[PDB]
Amino acid sequence: AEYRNWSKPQCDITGFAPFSKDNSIRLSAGGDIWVTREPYVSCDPDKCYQFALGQGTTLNNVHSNNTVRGRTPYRTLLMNELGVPFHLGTKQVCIAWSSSSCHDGKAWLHVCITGDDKNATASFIYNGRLVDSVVSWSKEILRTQESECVCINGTCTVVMTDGSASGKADTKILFIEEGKIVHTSTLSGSAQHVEECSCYPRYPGVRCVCRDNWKGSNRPIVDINIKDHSIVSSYVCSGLVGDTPRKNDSSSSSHCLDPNNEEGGHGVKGWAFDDGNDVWMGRTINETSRLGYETFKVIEGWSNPKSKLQINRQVIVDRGNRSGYSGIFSVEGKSCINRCFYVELIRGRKEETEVLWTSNSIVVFCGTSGTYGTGSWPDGADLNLMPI
Amino acid sequence: AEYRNWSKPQCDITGFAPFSKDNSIRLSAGGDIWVTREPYVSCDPDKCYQFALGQGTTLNNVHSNNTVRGRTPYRTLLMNELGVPFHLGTKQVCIAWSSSSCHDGKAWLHVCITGDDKNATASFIYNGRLVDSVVSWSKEILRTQESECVCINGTCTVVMTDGSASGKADTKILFIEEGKIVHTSTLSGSAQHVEECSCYPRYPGVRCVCRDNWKGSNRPIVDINIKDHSIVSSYVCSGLVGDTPRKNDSSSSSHCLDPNNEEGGHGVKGWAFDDGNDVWMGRTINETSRLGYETFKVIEGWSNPKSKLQINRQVIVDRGNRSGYSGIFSVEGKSCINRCFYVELIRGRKEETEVLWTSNSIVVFCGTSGTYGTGSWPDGADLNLMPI
Amino acid sequence: AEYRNWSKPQCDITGFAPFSKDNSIRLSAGGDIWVTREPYVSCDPDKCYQFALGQGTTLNNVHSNNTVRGRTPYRTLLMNELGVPFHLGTKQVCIAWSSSSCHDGKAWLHVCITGDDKNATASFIYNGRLVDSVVSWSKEILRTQESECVCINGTCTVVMTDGSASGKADTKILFIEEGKIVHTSTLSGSAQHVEECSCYPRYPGVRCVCRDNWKGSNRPIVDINIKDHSIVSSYVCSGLVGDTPRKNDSSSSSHCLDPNNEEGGHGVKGWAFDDGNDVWMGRTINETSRLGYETFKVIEGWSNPKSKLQINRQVIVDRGNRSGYSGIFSVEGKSCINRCFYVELIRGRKEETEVLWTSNSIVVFCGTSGTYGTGSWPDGADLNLMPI
Amino acid sequence: AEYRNWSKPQCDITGFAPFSKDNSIRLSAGGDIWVTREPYVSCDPDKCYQFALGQGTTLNNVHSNNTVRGRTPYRTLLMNELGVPFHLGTKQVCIAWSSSSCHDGKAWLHVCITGDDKNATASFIYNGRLVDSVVSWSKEILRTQESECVCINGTCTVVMTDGSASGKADTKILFIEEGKIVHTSTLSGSAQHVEECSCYPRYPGVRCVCRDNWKGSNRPIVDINIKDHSIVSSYVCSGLVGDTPRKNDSSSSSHCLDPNNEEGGHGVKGWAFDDGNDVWMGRTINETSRLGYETFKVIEGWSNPKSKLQINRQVIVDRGNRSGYSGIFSVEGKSCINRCFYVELIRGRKEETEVLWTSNSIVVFCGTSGTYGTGSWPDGADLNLMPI
Numbered sequence A, B, C, D: 001a002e003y004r005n006w007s008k009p010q011c012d013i014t015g016f017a018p019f020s021k022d023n024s025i026r027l028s029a030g031g032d033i034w035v036t037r038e039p040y041v042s043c044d045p046d047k048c049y050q051f052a053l054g055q056g057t058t059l060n061n062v063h064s065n066n067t068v069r070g071r072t073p074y075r076t077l078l079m080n081e082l083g084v085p086f087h088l089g090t091k092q093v094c095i096a097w098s099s100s101s102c103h104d105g106k107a108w109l110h111v112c113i114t115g116d117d118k119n120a121t122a123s124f125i126y127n128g129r130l131v132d133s134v135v136s137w138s139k140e141i142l143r144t145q146e147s148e149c150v151c152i153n154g155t156c157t158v159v160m161t162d163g164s165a166s167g168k169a170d171t172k173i174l175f176i177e178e179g180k181i182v183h184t185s186t187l188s189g190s191a192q193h194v195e196e197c198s199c200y201p202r203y204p205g206v207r208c209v210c211r212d213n214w215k216g217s218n219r220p221i222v223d224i225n226i227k228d229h230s231i232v233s234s235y236v237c238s239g240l241v242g243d244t245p246r247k248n249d250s251s252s253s254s255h256c257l258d259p260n261n262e263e264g265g266h267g268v269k270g271w272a273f274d275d276g277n278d279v280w281m282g283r284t285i286n287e288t289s290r291l292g293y294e295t296f297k298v299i300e301g302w303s304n305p306k307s308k309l310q311i312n313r314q315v316i317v318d319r320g321n322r323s324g325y326s327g328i329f330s331v332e333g334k335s336c337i338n339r340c341f342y343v344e345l346i347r348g349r350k351e352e353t354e355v356l357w358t359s360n361s362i363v364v365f366c367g368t369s370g371t372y373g374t375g376s377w378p379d380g381a382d383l384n385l386m387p388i
């Protein structure tokens, strides 16, 4: 085994082809399936895994009540091969209400945060042993990506925040060799509020498209130099913006350097990536709530903050159906690195009151240089007909 | 590992011996089992896998209601080792209401079609990653084999159809190397309507026995040349016909070049293969609906449309029990390649109205050069006692 | 991977020590467990597996009513690692209402009989594929060991029988190289009725202790010579006899050559093995029923049909608890071949009417050269309380 | 594969970071989970496994009633990967109401005890086969560690006791090479009563911190020399003592050589390990009950029996929540041997009467040299609401 360098060009991408879907909530109506949220996909050199933070209970279970709450001591990082639903034989790989995982080509890293809000612990697990931990620095919800970290040459980088979800916070970027923290750099550049980063390799470094939970409906971008540990940061230029909430396409604007200040409060984890001066991105279809999901390419969207020229829209989940988090993951091919993404399909509370629980299922798409058509792959469960 | 060439002669067949049976519906009255249809079997160099298209629900479950419907966004391809029932830990390998898979010797290829009826997408997945896709070309249910594809020296071939199910359609033969579509031939020769091909390697090429849904109750054959990508086509000569519906053994007739026009409308997926000038084949026992299943050899049935002389008949499923799709798979022995087949056992709607679901179990048999007896292996579930 | 040849002397044995227990019936009161009978154990060069003949249903399931019936088309051979009970992701490896399996050093052989009573088929599955098959020769319930077959230098051997359960029958011994029946010797010697041989390697040949269902309560021995294919047979001398029914310890008698003729009709599968002129053996504790199970050594019991001198008795199952079939398997150690045995713990119909089903669980012991205490390890389910 | 030698220095430890949590009881409210007790953790060279003793039943099962009882014939050793809860595909690896397992770098040893109280058998199982066994020596509950044994250069050591739980008993230390008992040394030195050793490698020896069920609320220490099988023993000096019951902190005292005589009757399996002259240790938070769990370093606690100077307390389970047994396990990192521990979270009878059953879940922490914060990770099931 050798380390992953990801030293290959990014695949041509004309859009995205259907890759996976686990019908988890549908299955949980006549089967024992975990209650989860904040899923993500990451792959080893051979195959892909679906990860999620479980709520320490199955769906049909009295303990599914109040799973709307996102940090308890019962939450663990669940790990299956992609498309194996989270049944009872699933491995809980660490204790976590916030995580990130990646494979460096030799083994798995998990970064798992659990504990008190004001005094959380991050565990660093490499090759199924605990190799390090770090305490919260700002004593206010230590939290990380909820999607894959990125390793190059045996150095994994990951992005962590501690501090306000509505004001300056302390974002750091950790550099990990075999589960050992070898460096911590602090967020630098003009990105003002960075959460829940979707990172992807972009040799020779990593790039991340995050959530601005404070004053932005544009998403931040963090670049990480893996060799000198330097950081830079800014925002996705595209005039069509990628956060929810946001302003409609006719009213919306952006900036390459600052939060656009447009319905900036709150957000949702999402992703984007560059393709020369254009940008690929997904977002909820509905501007104010997490309904629907679509991807498109904004032409000049990476370098021109006035560009509102999209093409190649695909509906992934139609606007009448629920979405949630999304994130990127990268997959090595023969000649090129491909880009894929998952969409968390959230069902239950608070939005939907006919059940007492909150959970999700997922749908995953991947980049293609070929052709594709259309459709919509929502969750599909009838909550009117699920357990009392 | 090495590429499969299939470059050994076909085994002697004196008939087929019992190989596998999953008792899926019988288990689902006391277990969480998937609801499926369009199953099939394919094997890697070491062992055999059973596939089916899920309905994104288990049987005992509110979402099993109305799974008579064959194309929904919830359908996925399920893959277990052969003889492992589709329990809740079964892997969904891709999104699909129509699929074909095969192993080229080094890795699996899955061909997976989902999306809108008029704008469906085929995904190609190889060694666990999405390598290609293609849009529907004629905007009318892009569909494929529902049984193993076939790979020779690195090149996998698959047959796909887009268009009318009761008139001319556009059928093509894709050539795929490591999941990459490298060439695309159009259906050629005298086969007028082609669906749901059962293909096998017949070195140096591939042969398929398909379902003419339009004007034939005889079965199309398609020869695919893997090196120059050429395609010839015709019908199964044998005067005993393999489609359902069809006319009885007395009235029935055929033709080597054209559909017979005998209750030719509609059909059922099936197989047949050549043994010199004789043909081994299976079919439902009943002439007009999917009841029973039988196999025999027709002496000169491969090459003489007037041949109505069968021998070595075996009842696989008796005429009072439901049957369904059936297809071929091939397995490499020490010195020869063998031919096996599965038979889908369909239970539920529309035919059986005591339940709201439609699902199936499978039985599987393999070519033997030894001797054998008699029996019947139906589904064995009591729908009158089932999860009501 | 080399072929096993068992060319090491038998281990010293002082008795047997607890090895494994699957608690299958106790679990199926609150989970999905298969209904089974006719279990056995065989091991690959690394680990052991447990087998049984499924009834195509789980216990808590409408389909388990009437599982007293030992031959249906829904029966399949189950295979897990030893100690993994037969839950829903258990692999069915073949269609079988009678079977035998073994591993030859490189791969599994499985011998699986199913079909009509009057015309059953044996299928021979090696290294994942069907390689051969035979019809019933005498058209009366073709059947085989229900326990491990034995392979030496790549030749496996299995004893099968076709014919009357209660008068002269046709017993053959097949030799199988890589799934291929390379020879068939007919039964020869003194043994007059032979069923369910529990065989073991005894380099350079194989030995079996069987069940006489006709006029013997002494158990038959069958010697199989693997190079010349010759067959001798006789009975186990011991004045203490293995079969059930039998006459009590005071009244019983035996013969090194002929059925002893005492309550001989009917029987139960069991085992014994020589140790110089002494014999190790197990048997039920009730002389008339499949209640309890014991093992002891009979001093000179292997060459003196007058020896009723036992020692080293162990109760495996106490006398007020149900037992059933029992069988030997062999396990290669560093310097010697050890011998072990399993005991089928039959619960339900017809002997127990609180339930509708019939099933078993199993307990497994292994030869020890060290020391050991006492106990009882019954099935332990409360049928007064199980599923309706 | 070489044998583990553990010839690495012990890791710097500043405290413990969360590693794993199985949520077993929470899950059992809506799934098929095993009833267990006396859990522990042990790792092969790659990954950790969670072991426990089952009660031969699942929780939502009639047979969970009276699982308070700790030696039945239906108790088996359960073994999964760490994080996979004990569902029905869980392997039972031997018959046990008492056990110890370790990996020597080449394979697994399991030491398994079952049988009558007055006449129990210990079976030694290595590389998946029975290699040895030993009878009870004092004919009064032969019993062993309930945590990992330790192997150095292929010689594994284990600690077993037989005799009174409240008076002088007969404690032996066995030495086992690939399954074979090669030596038995007897306990020696000043420890007067020794149960349930939590042992760990301390090159070139092995060191255990045990439970005095007689007169000591300080914990016995046993040292084991592996080359010449000599044994020394004593007690943990620390004035803060590990056992439950014990005296409160103000009132307690200890002794380096003798049971302290302070509420000695009874106790609980627990652990400790030296760090210079300092001691790391855990214990229940409540002095008299198995409520809560905590860890700390006692400054000079290893050599100064009057030290009561704790630092680096961590709460693992808050004091309003139930704990239970705990023990150590060692994981080899790149340059040092780490120390970890697991805590049994007992729920149900007799302490809690809302349910008829007794079971547990587990939490696992591992030593860290990094930093960490605070929390509490209890069982989290609600019995007011569980099955029935």
Ligand SMILES: *[C@@H]1O[C@H](CO)[C@@H](O[C@@H]2O[C@H](CO)[C@@H](O[C@@H]3O[C@H](CO[C@@H]4O[C@H](CO)[C@@H](O)[C@H](O)[C@@H]4O)[C@@H](O)[C@H](O[C@@H]4O[C@H](CO)[C@@H](O)[C@H](O)[C@@H]4O)[C@@H]3O)[C@H](O)[C@H]2NC(C)=O)[C@H](O)[C@H]1NC(C)=O
Residues within 6 Å of the ligand: A014, A015, A249, A296, A310, A311, A312, A313, A314, A372, A373, A374, B118, B119
């Ligand atoms: C079958 O499936 C394929 C693949 O999914 C569909 O083709 C896709 O259709 C999308 C919807 O029309 C196309 O995306 C749109 O692209 C427009 C591009 O503008 C074009 O100008 C170029 C030259 O520069 C021309 O080729 C095109 O003809 C266009 O006129 C965008 O303007 C459009 O953006 C918006 O429209 C949407 C609604 O669609 C609004 O929601 C949005 O706010 C904005 O006003 C959108 O991005 C997509 O590119 C195309 N993809 C490919 C690869 O061809 C077929 O249409 C499907 N057919 C059926 C019958 O379902």
Ligand SMILES: *[C@@H]1O[C@H](CO)[C@@H](O[C@@H]2O[C@H](CO)[C@@H](O[C@@H]3O[C@H](CO[C@@H]4O[C@H](CO)[C@@H](O)[C@H](O)[C@@H]4O)[C@@H](O)[C@H](O[C@@H]4O[C@H](CO)[C@@H](O)[C@H](O)[C@@H]4O)[C@@H]3O)[C@H](O)[C@H]2NC(C)=O)[C@H](O)[C@H]1NC(C)=O
Residues within 6 Å of the ligand: B249, B296, B310, B311, B312, B313, B314, B372, B373, B374, C118, C119, C135
């Ligand atoms: C035990 O197990 C074996 C294996 O299944 C059974 O043997 C099979 O029985 C089948 C039915 O008898 C045989 O298939 C038939 O083959 C017939 C050929 O008849 C022969 O005539 C030729 C040429 O004149 C001779 O060479 C042969 O020796 C035969 O005597 C077909 O005519 C027949 O075709 C039909 O009959 C069926 C009903 O069976 C109709 O449905 C059909 O429409 C048509 O009129 C049929 O195909 C089969 O070959 C034979 N297999 C082997 C290997 O022997 C035994 O019958 C079973 N024994 C018991 C007691 O059940």
Ligand SMILES: *[C@@H]1O[C@H](CO)[C@@H](O[C@@H]2O[C@H](CO)[C@@H](O[C@@H]3O[C@H](CO[C@@H]4O[C@H](CO)[C@@H](O)[C@H](O)[C@@H]4O)[C@@H](O)[C@H](O[C@@H]4O[C@H](CO)[C@@H](O)[C@H](O)[C@@H]4O)[C@@H]3O)[C@H](O)[C@H]2NC(C)=O)[C@H](O)[C@H]1NC(C)=O
Residues within 6 Å of the ligand: C014, C249, C296, C310, C311, C312, C313, C314, C372, C373, C374, D118, D119
């Ligand atoms: C703890 O666990 C051990 C091992 O399981 C028990 O020891 C075993 O006890 C058995 C039952 O007594 C022994 O087997 C018996 O052997 C008898 C022969 O008498 C002995 O023979 C030699 C010399 O003759 C001497 O070594 C002995 O000292 C004895 O005198 C057999 O006669 C006896 O056979 C029968 O008795 C049974 C009832 O028990 C009848 O069912 C039967 O029909 C027949 O009349 C039996 O085979 C066994 O060898 C022995 N094992 C070993 C290794 O020593 C301890 O007894 C256990 N302790 C407790 C309290 O349970």
Ligand SMILES: *[C@@H]1O[C@H](CO)[C@@H](O[C@@H]2O[C@H](CO)[C@@H](O[C@@H]3O[C@H](CO[C@@H]4O[C@H](CO)[C@@H](O)[C@H](O)[C@@H]4O)[C@@H](O)[C@H](O[C@@H]4O[C@H](CO)[C@@H](O)[C@H](O)[C@@H]4O)[C@@H]3O)[C@H](O)[C@H]2NC(C)=O)[C@H](O)[C@H]1NC(C)=O
Residues within 6 Å of the ligand: A118, A119, A135, D014, D015, D249, D296, D310, D311, D312, D313, D314, D372, D373, D374
């Ligand atoms: C966030 O998380 C970290 C790590 O969990 C916490 O820091 C830990 O807090 C513990 C509780 O105070 C510390 O353990 C205590 O250590 C005391 C030692 O006193 C020190 O003297 C040293 C040097 O000699 C100075 O540096 C310090 O100022 C210390 O004061 C012990 O005496 C103390 O002992 C007891 O108090 C406990 C607490 O109730 C009693 O139950 C007990 O019986 C006895 O009377 C205790 O062991 C721990 O060392 C410290 N760890 C580290 C690595 O820093 C933060 O406190 C957390 N913060 C929040 C806001 O949650």
Ligand SMILES: *[C@@H]1O[C@H](CO[C@@H]2O[C@@H](C)[C@@H](O)[C@@H](O)[C@@H]2O)[C@@H](O[C@@H]2O[C@H](CO)[C@@H](O)[C@H](O)[C@H]2NC(C)=O)[C@H](O[C@@H]2O[C@@H](C)[C@@H](O)[C@@H](O)[C@@H]2O)[C@H]1NC(C)=O
Residues within 6 Å of the ligand: D065, D066, D069, D356
């Ligand atoms: C739960 O278990 C109770 C105690 O069971 C006794 O010991 C166990 C180790 C077990 O193996 C069991 O067989 C033993 O009887 C049961 O109470 C016992 O019930 C039996 C007959 O029902 C009675 O003769 C015993 O005296 C009684 N023992 C005690 C200590 O109560 C429970 O059975 C129930 O409770 C009984 C008291 C009775 O009311 C009956 O209706 C119940 O079946 C077991 N509980 C349940 C819900 O099954």
Ligand SMILES: *[C@@H]1O[C@H](CO)[C@@H](O[C@@H]2O[C@H](CO)[C@@H](O)[C@H](O)[C@H]2NC(C)=O)[C@H](O)[C@H]1NC(C)=O
Residues within 6 Å of the ligand: A065, A066, A356
């Ligand atoms: C699910 O949980 C909710 C929230 O805890 C429960 O509602 C509470 O009920 C308790 C006691 O039953 C009341 O004292 C609280 O004031 C309620 N809280 C709120 C926020 O409404 C509810 O009972 C649970 N429902 C079920 C079916 O378990």
Ligand SMILES: *[C@@H]1O[C@H](CO[C@@H]2O[C@@H](C)[C@@H](O)[C@@H](O)[C@@H]2O)[C@@H](O)[C@H](O)[C@H]1NC(C)=O
Residues within 6 Å of the ligand: C065, C066, C356
């Ligand atoms: C259980 O079965 C009883 C006997 O059934 C007979 O044999 C079985 C194999 C079936 O073929 C069945 O149709 C036959 O009647 C029934 O008489 C009885 O009603 C059944 N019990 C229940 C509770 O359903």
Ligand SMILES: CCC(CC)O[C@@H]1C=C(C(=O)O)C[C@H](N)[C@H]1NC(C)=O
Residues within 6 Å of the ligand: A038, A070, A071, A097, A098, A141, A143, A165, A195, A213, A267, A268
């Ligand atoms: C703590 C701030 C962070 C948003 C930036 O909240 C996230 C919001 C969530 C959301 O927007 O759905 C749910 C996440 N589980 C949550 N994480 C934690 C640790 O609370």
Ligand SMILES: CCC(CC)O[C@@H]1C=C(C(=O)O)C[C@H](N)[C@H]1NC(C)=O
Residues within 6 Å of the ligand: B038, B070, B071, B097, B098, B141, B143, B165, B195, B213, B267, B268
């Ligand atoms: C669309 C025509 C095609 C066969 C001719 O329909 C098949 C009919 C079916 C059938 O005959 O049972 C079920 C198949 N799932 C269906 N395939 C799809 C993709 O709809």
Ligand SMILES: CCC(CC)O[C@@H]1C=C(C(=O)O)C[C@H](N)[C@H]1NC(C)=O
Residues within 6 Å of the ligand: C038, C070, C071, C097, C098, C141, C143, C165, C195, C213, C267, C268
């Ligand atoms: C057919 C004779 C044979 C032994 C005499 O019957 C066995 C007896 C049985 C028995 O005595 O329990 C049950 C076995 N399942 C059965 N096997 C078959 C194949 O029917």
Ligand SMILES: CCC(CC)O[C@@H]1C=C(C(=O)O)C[C@H](N)[C@H]1NC(C)=O
Residues within 6 Å of the ligand: D038, D070, D071, D097, D098, D141, D143, D165, D195, D213, D267, D268
């Ligand atoms: C027999 C003495 C022994 C240690 C004191 O008791 C242990 C105490 C127990 C306890 O204190 O919880 C439960 C253990 N299962 C038990 N082990 C056995 C085998 O009884």
Ligand SMILES: *[C@@H]1O[C@H](CO)[C@@H](O)[C@H](O)[C@H]1NC(C)=O
Residues within 6 Å of the ligand: B247, B248, B250, B251
């Ligand atoms: C077969 O079907 C035709 C109808 O086309 C009918 O006339 C004929 O009698 C049937 N044959 C037999 C043998 O029953």
Ligand SMILES: *[C@@H]1O[C@H](CO)[C@@H](O)[C@H](O)[C@H]1NC(C)=O
Residues within 6 Å of the ligand: B285, B286, B287, B288, B289, B291, B319
């Ligand atoms: C064929 O199937 C139908 C099922 O509805 C039945 O009524 C018909 O009589 C059957 N006929 C034959 C000849 O098998």
Ligand SMILES: *[C@@H]1O[C@H](CO)[C@@H](O)[C@H](O)[C@H]1NC(C)=O
Residues within 6 Å of the ligand: C286, C288, C289, C291
């Ligand atoms: C054997 O079992 C039967 C079954 O009930 C019982 O009646 C009988 O007493 C037992 N006989 C002996 C001698 O143990």
Ligand SMILES: *[C@@H]1O[C@H](CO)[C@@H](O)[C@H](O)[C@H]1NC(C)=O
Residues within 6 Å of the ligand: D248, D250, D251
């Ligand atoms: C400790 O124990 C005694 C009871 O024996 C009690 O008097 C005292 O208050 C306790 N001390 C503390 C600090 O709780």
Ligand SMILES: [Ca+2]
Residues within 6 Å of the ligand: A211, A212, A213, A214, A215, A216, A217, A218, A243, A244, A245, A263, A264, A265, A266, A267, A268
């Ligand atoms: Ca925002």
